[PDB]
Design a protein around this nucleic acid. Structure first.
Ligand SMILES: CNC(=O)[C@@H](C)[C@H]1C(=O)/C(=C(O)/C=C/C(C)=C/[C@@H](C)[C@H]2O[C@@]3(C)O[C@H](C=C[C@@]34CO4)[C@@H]2C)C(=O)N1[C@@H]1CC[C@H](O)[C@H](C)O1
Ligand SMILES: Nc1ncnc2c1ncn2[C@@H]1O[C@H](COP(=O)(O)CP(=O)(O)OP(=O)(O)O)[C@@H](O)[C@H]1O
Ligand SMILES: [Mg+2]
Ligand SMILES: [Mg+2]
Ligand SMILES: [Zn+2]
Ligand SMILES: [Zn+2]
Lengths: 283, 95, 594, 112, 105, 729
DNA sequence: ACGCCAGACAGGG
RNA sequence: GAGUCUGCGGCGCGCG
DNA sequence: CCCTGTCTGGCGTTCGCGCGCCG
């Protein structure tokens, strides 16, 4: 417990709180700096105040400001709220803030929020599609399975090397029809995942066999429209790709749609005939 | 759906174990050479631009096709962790 | 005719009888023909198709005139300002329900193949209350505050919903718009709090040997004062479906063995038996009484994996549970909060969060008998014995139904309404609370259409009581709240392995899901919700070594999950080829020197 | 190469502050406009925090990967890219003590 | 299948002295129904140029030997004054619907 | 408070001009205070629409004002009310304050009136937010019009009287999203304000005073008024809307025409004939198809595409700037240093792309050359250059390219060089280069459309005219809407429009049904009756009667209860037609569709295609500078978020590696993602996860604060997360 | 604005 | 034998 | 000095995506 007192203030790294070139010469640095300067100035000005001559009132008054400063970087708002000069009456994001809440830092880790091999478009029913598969735009597939395709290009005569294969696709007017054959081949038995707007249950995400199609829309099977609460008035679903042979394994063995027919909630199925089918089978 | 997933499910003690197996199998299928298979002859894996899947399309699609048969063996500790990769490299050539 | 239920059931059966993938084929088959037949059937909404009943004009008029009588009854001075209002509402509440069965009765008898009707009867689209607003009439729409308007909405959507009846209907839509969106974030939150405590729970086991099971009740006590009744087929199924019998039970003739996973058909057997009167409870392994401190076993969880066979070890049941509870909420938490039959999300929050409800009911701390007094100011319900009574102050607003004369067990309703967990625990014990929470929780969900398995509610509630207080120390001082099983550890080795029986006398503590997550052992998981500020302060002071178990904490690290494939049970599993098995044996044979 | 099985938060010993510390930020010198380079010892100096350059050093005596782990005889620069710059910590020696608000204003004052 | 106004570069331009815009005109050309008499005519380019205060109808196209226009009175455009319109409209024999993007003539 | 004007289409703009917002100065209303404010209070009458509010977290907080609502002296929305002294209604109006309105007994406009005389003893009036049946003698004031109770934006709904407030909201909102189609048709059924909208809005161009027309250019209509004056009226040819919609004024007046004061000279971006027009009238069969219209999917006939019926022009303004770096100014020239001439064709004008050039994704729109390193050259790149040709341009290729998604044809270009006329060039910015591109959006499967009532949905399948539902007469339907989406939601108004629409088709006329006073079920039955003769009358004379098909459906129809048994098929089809439904043949089989199916003209608009529609798929790309998580922007789409909600989903499953992958190889493992890529390039098996930067950054942040966070081993001992950069020196 | 938990202090024997 | 640097916090709105 | 009660002090309140703006 003798450490609860601060006589040494750790400074956060330089790049983390970015000193960057904005526009025309504008410079943006993380708020933490403003708070750090505060502390630094206070402490220095104190040392000098003690060394100059120390009139009681002024030494305390400063140590006071000092104290508050030290609070500033740690936690802002627990006692008063520091502000950047006349521009934004905003609380300088203190260490505490950075760590707590909704879009904080403890939340950025926990929820890990941005996948490298991701995609998202509008969904559209695909009536002939089987639970096993889903309709994924080829155009979308191309970017999604780019690396997987680059190699495949070299295994065939479409391209000499990777970098070659890259430039070959940098423009849309340059794609030989041979490339689609390559991609169609690359995705042979791989599967991708689909995500719905609010991911409420485990079925909120499912794995399907991509069947490359033309256009912008993504063809989703009708029976799974019940798992993901999704109609087709424009709902959009995201899509991910399992990179390791392991990830793909689990994804097509335990996360695929067709294998998760019953709901974890109830022993009831979630692949029951919906609004349209029942009407047909009734009549 | 997929080939006899039920059959496969029943072959293991825990769902999530089957996945492990299939995955590890698909792993060694590629690494030590893709011909490290136990059922290639008469009826085997196949794609249709040609009948070219016989060589290297999907790894685990084979694994399951194998496990569905009764040739492979999956234990909690069947063969000493390091000596397996050694004996495997010695007997399977393709690199 | 094939309804969504008849088909629902066909899927289910198909699943169990023929196999998974084969069922999948069936699904598509239905999918295709139902889609094709639909087109050809030529079912289409015509403004006309919505068919208004001829009785609509009668029932409206009959209720119209009756409204007059109530008015004349008030214009004289007979009915108090209130009585008038509550009486009018009653009139419409019934009249509207009358038009309801009327519309349907019309379709049922005259138009069996009505596009709108057929969609509502087939599990397709449509609701009884909705059809009512097109052919019958949407009659009562509350004012801004909550007091329903005295004037109904005589029109339907078929005919012109007038200028003003629309504006009056807007209030409810705005409130709905505002309430519905408030339920959505309150539900996700609840699921964050539900996950915050049950994330660590995972199936990793060997049949836990502590056979202390949960007894699933088939009959419920007070619907009407006291009449024993067969619980509903659904609720009972929710409790015993795919469970594991803790002990052997011989009922109607067959021999239900121990550990056997009861199928839906078995759960059907028991009911039929209960019908005949051979069984009042059911021994079953439940998460409510598992020994595995962190995690639950195969026999106590049950059946339901996404697959219909026993639960596969390594399945994140904690989350699986937490989810099955958070989804139905979003759907029923909106109506249940909105209304007589059911109070919702606010209650589901008051439930998972142990706390003191709106209308409280003084429970009987003593179990003897009840009796009541007459004096002016405050009434009083006493649980007494010729030795002592537990005085219960019941002010003016509360209504008591226990009477001058008979018995009242500990924690029994002495007042009418809601009960406080802490008090029931103290009076009737833990076993009772758990059981109360569970069923009191399902009440809400059942009353709104969702059918979730008891399993899930159990998983969580358990964690609600994963903690306890201490009153007879040994290693660390008395007032302390610590993990129940961690005391079972201390107590077990301080009496069995090392001598000197220092009984570690504890007290069951009921803590709300939120509080349990707030205060758990690891801090990493606590650093997530409550106060990262606090959580860490203490965890620091006391160099706390976060042993990584549980998915929350182990996820932050970016490390493999302690459950699943990371499941210590299957992380390690090797595969062999008979060709490599003999080659390995050839390596053992080469071991014989010279 | 080991598996991370337990994490643990513990209070900071002034000596530990310094131990994680590389260099000491003693002056409020962000970056001087003429050259977008760190001013002095300040908040962004490269010693205290890290290589403003890839594998290359300061003056350029040693510039590639062959000698990746040695420091420059006339200038102290060991290198990998500039990640070392973002992982290193610095400490500020406060004159007269001050306390953690995290321990003082928490409803239960851990200190009170 | 294609059109070329002499001073126009893109499809979204407007020609002075001409009320209609290139888009409205190209549209009205889709309405033009021509009828050739034999396979030898796979691709025929109809030429037309009109100036001044005159209405440009489809019969204003200079006649071609084996091709006939059954849509004469179709309104191509309204020319004001100093209205200079000189275009070449391609015509082909095919089947179904082909987006202007698919062929790109 | 001040925002981008939303000008998807004129009505959108207009609506965004008058909507009342709560959030603002902050002094007034904040964001999480509101359940009492968010409610539609009593006084909101004629002052604030109770419908125009948004769907989502910020709800009830923002709302456009009402019809005649007018702010008097001090911010009080007053509403028009006409005076009625005694049983006498006047044509006199009093814009009354919210407060004064409570002092009187006001009545509704639907009250039977002979002129100034109330017509029924027991007639409706509303005291103070309370419905009261008053007598003609107490009626002190009456409402101006049902319209005043609502907003402009809502007023535009055909039969608003038959739709549920919730789906109605989606209605009024959708209109604000309408995109101007080159082809603009007015609804077959209107309400009465379509005209007023394009007029008070500044869509069309009206004639000031009476006169004649001189010149009618595609760019100007110089009119000559009778006062001896003549004005040249330029027309915004093709301008860029904020939201990238085309704004063009198409002259509707011929040369030399005596124009009446206030008559359309030109039509606005979306007007047909001085009428508000968005999306287009289209014949629709309201039946179920395979699954193409399952929950809310829409089946479209390829026929709508043949004739550009759903076509929209979209202009996007890509822009590039020549920045001044201390390494060397970034020049703008035709020279793209490394590989081909084939990519330089469209870049005809040295540097700039040539106008009227088809630009596909990945083509150079503008070329730019900056410098390769930060301050030093490259030892490894120095040898490569020398081997094939040391003399290589050190300049790096930083040229504005067509971002993935779509480009069209280059319509306009803007270049602002050194000696600036009266332009404001930002500092450092040497010069800027604007590139407007436009493209025809032929209605495709990805797009979404919806009718004014609330039926929203996306196109699932473009059926060939060859086999979709066709009418007795060869006339085939254009869209097929799923019936199931109508019972649940409550909006019979759509089914009422279809029927009225049906009559208008064969009767060849448009209508205007007011808000609550519009058309009635009997009257529409009437017009339909008139339609049966146009439909079946010509059929009688053209030479033929009824089909075996038409007769069988009749049998199944009477067995149903749609036609009285015993009457002639001619008489029965009429009865059935009056019901709003006719017989339809499959088109694929030629057989009829057992049972009459309604059909009619329904007004359906296309919703604006945001960069949210034009899909985002990412392989690899940039990364954040402080957090090492993937992010895009300009040309690299940027990764999707995996949120805790989703983490749990994987958590539930036994997907350990899949989750590990998500937190490591895919987003934060700096060394992992690198080796991962390379491994995949080779056809290798991705390496095992290194620690994520978010963790590391977390640790150090926690370290910035006193707290010491140290990882440990099996036995409580260290382990190292920062691989070797934390050790000192 | 709210709701909820947990808290520290002050009043009545 | 290719790799840097920018996109942040907040606000408004709109979709599911 | 004890127990009880009252205002008091701190935290939390879905998820994801688009667009556009601004120091
Ligand atoms: C757990 N909570 C409960 O269910 C009960 C207990 C309790 C509660 O905790 C409530 C609230 O916390 C309400 C918060 C409000 C009005 C939030 C706004 C800011 C919301 O507005 C919008 C704009 O944004 C968000 C979400 C949706 C919104 C509406 O669109 C946002 C959240 C609540 O309604 N209760 C009722 C009240 C009446 C009475 O006192 C009764 C006893 O208890
Ligand atoms: N604020 C919000 N948060 C989360 N999801 C939302 C949302 N608003 C809309 N949605 C999602 O999209 C759907 C929109 O809700 P609705 O479709 O109106 C519900 P509903 O009760 O199913 O109406 P319906 O059955 O008549 O179609 C929901 O199922 C929800 O998942
Ligand atoms: Mg939807
Ligand atoms: Mg819905
Ligand atoms: Zn157990
Ligand atoms: Zn050096």
């Amino acid at each position: 417990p003798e450490w609860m007192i601060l006589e040494a203030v750790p400074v956060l790294p330089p790049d983390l709180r970015p000193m960057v070139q904005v526009d025309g010469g504008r410079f943006a640095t993380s708020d933490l700096n403003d708070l750090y300067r505060r502390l630094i100035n206070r402490n220095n000005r104190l040392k000098k105040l003690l060394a100059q001559g120390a009139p009681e009132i002024i030494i305390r008054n400063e140590k006071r400001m000092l104290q508050e400063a030290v609070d500033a970087l740690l936690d802002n708002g627990r006692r008063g709220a520091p502000v950047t000069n006349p521009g934004s009456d905003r609380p300088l994001r203190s260490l505490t803030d950075i760590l707590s809440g909704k879009q904080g830092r403890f939340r950025q880790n926990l929820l890990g929020k941005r996948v490298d091999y991701s995609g998202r478009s509008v969904i559209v029913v695909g009536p002939q599609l089987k639970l096993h598969q889903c309709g994924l735009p080829k155009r979308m597939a191309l970017e999604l399975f780019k690396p997987f395709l680059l190699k495949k290009m070299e295994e065939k005569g479409i391209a000499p090397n990777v970098k070659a294969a890259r430039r070959m696709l940098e423009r849309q007017r340059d794609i030989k029809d041979e490339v689609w054959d390559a991609l169609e081949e690359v995705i042979h038995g791989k599967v991708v995942l689909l995500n719905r707007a609010p991911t409420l249950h485990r079925l909120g995400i499912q794995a399907f066999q991509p069947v490359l199609v033309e256009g912008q829309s993504i063809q989703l099977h009708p029976l799974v429209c019940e798992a993901f609460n999704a109609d087709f008035d424009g709902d959009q679903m995201a899509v991910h790709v399992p990179l390791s042979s392991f990830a793909q394994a689990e994804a097509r063995i335990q996360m695929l749609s067709a294998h998760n027919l019953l709901s974890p909630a109830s022993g009831e199925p979630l692949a029951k005939p919906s609004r349209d089918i029942i009407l047909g089978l009734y009549y | 759906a997929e080939p006899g997933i039920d059959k496969l499910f029943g072959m293991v003690d825990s769902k999530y174990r089957l996945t492990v197996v299939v995955a590890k199998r698909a792993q060694q299928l590629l690494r030590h050479g893709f011909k490290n298979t136990v059922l290639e002859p008469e009826e085997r894996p196949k794609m249709q631009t040609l009948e070219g899947l016989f060589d290297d399309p999907n790894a685990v699609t084979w694994a399951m096709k194998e496990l569905l048969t009764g040739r492979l063996v999956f234990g909690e500790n069947l063969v000493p962790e390091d000596r397996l990769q050694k004996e495997m490299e010695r007997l399977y050539p393709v690199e | 005719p094939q309804e969504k239920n008849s088909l629902k059931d066909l899927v289910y059966q198909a699943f169990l009888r023929l196999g998974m993938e084969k069922t999948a084929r069936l699904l598509d088959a239905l999918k295709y023909y139902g889609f094709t037949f639909s087109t050809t059937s030529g079912i289409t909404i015509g403004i006309d198709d919505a068919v208004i009943p001829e009785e609509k004009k009668q029932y409206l008029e009959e209720a119209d005139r009756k409204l007059l009588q109530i008015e004349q009854a008030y214009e004289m001075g007979f009915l108090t300002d209130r009585e008038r209002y509550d009486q009018i509402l009653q009139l419409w509440t019934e009249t509207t329900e009358k038009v309801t069965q009327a519309v349907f009765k019309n379709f049922e008898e005259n138009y069996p193949f009505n596009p709108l009707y057929v969609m509502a009867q087939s599990g397709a689209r449509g609701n009884p209350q909705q059809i009512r607003q097109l052919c019958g009439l949407r009659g009562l729409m509350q004012k801004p505050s909550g007091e329903t308007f005295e004037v109904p909405v005589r029109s339907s959507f078929r005919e012109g919903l007038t200028v003003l009846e629309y504006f009056i209907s807007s209030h409810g839509a705005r409130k709905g718009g505002a309430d519905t969106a408030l339920r959505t974030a309150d539900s996700g939150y609840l699921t964050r709090k539900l996950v915050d405590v049950t994330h660590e729970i995972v199936v990793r086991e060997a049949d836990c040997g502590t056979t202390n099971y949960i007894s699933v009740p088939l009959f419920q006590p007070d619907e009407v004062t006291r009449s024993l009744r067969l619980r509903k087929r659904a609720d009972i199924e929710a409790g015993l479906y795919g469970r594991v019998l803790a002990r052997e039970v011989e009922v109607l003739g067959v021999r239900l063995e121990e550990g056997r996973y009861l199928s839906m058909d078995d759960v059907h057997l028991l009911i039929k038996a209960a019908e005949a009167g051979e069984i009042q409870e059911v021994p079953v392994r439940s998460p409510l009484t598992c020994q595995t401190r962190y995690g639950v076993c195969q026999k106590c969880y049950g059946y339901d994996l996404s697959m219909a066979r026993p639960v596969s070890i390594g399945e994140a049941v904690g989350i699986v549970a937490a989810q099955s509870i958070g989804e139905p909420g979003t759907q029923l938490t909106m109506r249940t909060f909105h209304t007589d039959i059911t109070q919702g999300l606010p209650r589901v929050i008051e439930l998972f969060e142990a706390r003191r409800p709106k209308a409280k009911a003084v429970i009987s701390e003593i179990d003897g008998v009840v009796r009541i007094e007459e004096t002016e100011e405050k009434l009083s319900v006493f649980v007494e014995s010729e030795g002592f009574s537990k005085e219960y102050k019941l002010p003016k607003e509360a209504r008591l139904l226990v009477k001058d004369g008979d018995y009242v067990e500990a924690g029994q309703p002495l007042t009418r309404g809601a009960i406080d967990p802490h008090q029931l625990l103290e009076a009737k014990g833990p076993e009772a609370v758990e059981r109360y929470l569970v069923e009191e929780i399902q009440k809400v969900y059942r009353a709104q259409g969702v059918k979730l398995h008891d399993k899930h509610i159990e998983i969580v509630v358990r964690q609600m009581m994963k903690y306890v207080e201490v009153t007879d120390p040994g290693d660390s001082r008395l007032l302390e709240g610590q993990v129940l099983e961690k005391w079972d550890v201390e107590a077990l080795n301080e009496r069995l392995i090392a001598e000197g029986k220092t009984p570690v006398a504890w007290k069951p503590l009921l803590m709300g899901v939120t509080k349990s997550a707030l205060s758990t052992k690891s801090w990493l998981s606590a650093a997530s919700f409550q106060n990262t500020t606090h959580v860490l302060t203490e965890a620091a002071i006391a160099g706390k070594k976060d042993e990584l178990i549980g998915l929350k904490e182990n996820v932050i690290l970016g490390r493999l999950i302690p459950a699943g494939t990371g499941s210590d049970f299957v992380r390690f599993t090797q595969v062999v080829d008979q060709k490599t098995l003999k080659a390995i044996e050839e390596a053992r044979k080469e071991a014989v020197e010279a | 190469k080991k598996e991370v099985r337990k994490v643990r938060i513990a209070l900071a010993s002034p000596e530990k502050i310094r131990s994680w510390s590389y260099g000491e930020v003693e002056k409020p010198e962000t970056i001087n406009y003429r050259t977008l380079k760190p001013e002095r010892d300040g908040l962004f100096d490269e010693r205290i925090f890290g290589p403003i350059k890839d594998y290359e050093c300061a003056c350029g005596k040693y510039k590639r990967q062959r000698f990746e782990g040695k420091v420059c005889e006339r200038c102290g620069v060991e290198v990998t890219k500039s990640i070392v710059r973002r992982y290193r910590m610095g400490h500020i020696e406060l004159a007269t003590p001050a306390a953690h608000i995290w321990f003082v204003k928490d409803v239960p004052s851990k200190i009170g | 299948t294609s059109v070329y106004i002499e001073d126009v570069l893109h499809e979204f331009s407007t020609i002075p002295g001409v009320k209609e815009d290139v888009v409205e005109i190209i549209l009205n050309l889709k309405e033009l129904v021509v009828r050739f008499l034999n396979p030898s005519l796979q691709t025929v380019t109809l030429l037309l140029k009109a100036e001044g205060p005159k209405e440009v109808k489809a019969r204003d196209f200079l006649p071609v030997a084996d091709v006939e226009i059954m849509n004469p009175d179709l309104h191509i455009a309204t020319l004001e004054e100093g209205g200079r319109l000189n275009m070449e409209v391609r015509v082909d024999r095919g089947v179904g619907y082909v987006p202007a993007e698919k062929h790109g003539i | 408070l001040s925002q981008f004007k939303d000008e998807t289409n004129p009505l959108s703009s207009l609506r965004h001009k008058r909507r009342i917002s709560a959030l603002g100065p902050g002094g007034l209303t904040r964001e999480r205070a509101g359940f009492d404010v968010r409610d539609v209070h009593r006084t909101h009458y004629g002052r604030i629409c109770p419908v125009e509010t948004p769907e989502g977290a910020n709800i009830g907080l923002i709302t456009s004002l009402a019809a005649y609502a007018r702010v008097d002296e001090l911010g009080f929305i007053r509403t028009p009310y006409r005076r009625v002294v005694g049983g006498v209604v006047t044509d006199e109006v009093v814009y009354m304050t919210a407060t004064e309105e409570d002092r009187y007994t006001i009545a509704q406009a639907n009250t039977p009136l002979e002129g100034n005389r109330i017509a029924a003893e027991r007639v409706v009036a509303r005291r103070k937010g309370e419905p009261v049946i008053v007598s003609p003698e107490e009626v002190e004031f009456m409402d101006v019009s049902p319209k005043q109770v609502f907003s402009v934006n809502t007023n535009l709904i055909p039969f608003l009287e038959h739709d549920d407030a919730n789906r109605a909201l989606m209605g009024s909102n959708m209109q604000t999203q309408a995109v101007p189609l080159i082809r603009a048709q007015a609804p077959v059924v209107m309400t009465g304000l379509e005209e007023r909208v394009v007029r008070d809005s500044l869509a069309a161009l009206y004639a000031e005073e009476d006169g004649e027309v001189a010149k009618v250019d595609g760019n100007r209509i110089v009119v000559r008024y009778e006062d001896g004056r003549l004005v040249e009226y330029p027309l915004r040819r093709f301008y860029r809307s904020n939201q990238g919609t085309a704004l063009d004024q198409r002259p509707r007046v011929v040369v030399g025409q005596r124009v009446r004061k206030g008559d359309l000279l030109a039509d606005g971006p979306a007007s047909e004939n001085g009428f508000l027009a968005l999306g287009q009238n289209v014949l629709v069969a309201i039946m179920p198809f395979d699954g193409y219209n399952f929950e809310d999917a829409i089946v479209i006939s390829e026929e709508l595409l043949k004739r550009d019926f759903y076509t929209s022009i979209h202009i996007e303004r890509y822009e590039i700037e020549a920045r001044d770096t201390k390494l060397g100014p970034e020049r703008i020239t035709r020279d793209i240093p490394h590989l081909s001439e084939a990519a330089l064709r469209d870049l005809d004008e040295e540097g700039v792309v040539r106008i009227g050039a088809e630009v596909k994704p990945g083509d150079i729109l503008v070329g730019r050359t900056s410098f390769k390193g930060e301050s030093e050259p490259t030892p490894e790149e120095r040898l490569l250059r020398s081997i094939f040709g040391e003399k290589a341009r050190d300049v790096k290729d930083t040229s504005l390219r067509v971002p993935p998604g779509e480009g069209g044809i280059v319509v306009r270009t803007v270049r602002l060089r050194r000696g600036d006329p009266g332009v404001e060039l930002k500092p450092g910015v040497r010069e800027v280069v604007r590139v407007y591109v436009a493209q025809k959006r032929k209605l495709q499967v990805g797009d979404k459309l919806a009718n004014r009532h609330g039926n929203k949905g996306v196109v699932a399948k473009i059926l060939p005219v060859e086999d979709m539902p066709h009418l007795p007469d060869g006339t085939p339907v254009d869209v097929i809407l799923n019936p199931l989406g109508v019972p649940s939601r409550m909006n019979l108004g759509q089914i009422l429009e279809t029927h009225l629409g049906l009559a208008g088709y064969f009767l060849g006329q448009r209508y205007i049904s007011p808000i609550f006073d519009g058309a009635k079920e009997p009257e529409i039955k009437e017009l339909l009756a008139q339609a049966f003769e146009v439909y079946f009358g010509k059929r009688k004379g053209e030479g033929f009667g009824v089909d075996k098909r038409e007769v069988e459906v009749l049998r199944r129809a009477e067995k149903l209860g749609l036609v009285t048994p015993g009457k002639t098929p001619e008489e029965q089809l009429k009865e059935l037609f009056l019901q709003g439904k006719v017989v339809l043949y499959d088109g694929r089989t030629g057989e009829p569709i057992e049972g009459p199916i309604v059909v009619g003209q329904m007004f359906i608009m296309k919703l604006y295609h945001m960069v949210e529609d034009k899909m985002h798929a990412r392989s690899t790309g940039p990364y954040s500078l402080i957090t090492q998580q993937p992010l895009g922007g300009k040309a690299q789409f940027g990764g999707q978020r995996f949120g805790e909600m989703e983490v749990w989903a994987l958590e539930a499953y036994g997907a350990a590696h899949t989750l590990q992958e998500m937190l490591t190889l895919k987003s934060d493992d700096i060394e992992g993602r690198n080796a991962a890529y390379e491994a995949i390039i080779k056809g290798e098996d991705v390496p095992e996860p290194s620690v994520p930067e978010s963790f590391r950054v977390l640790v150090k942040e926690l370290q910035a604060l006193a707290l010491d966070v140290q990882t440990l081993d099996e036995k409580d001992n260290p382990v190292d997360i920062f691989e070797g950069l934390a050790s000192k020196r």
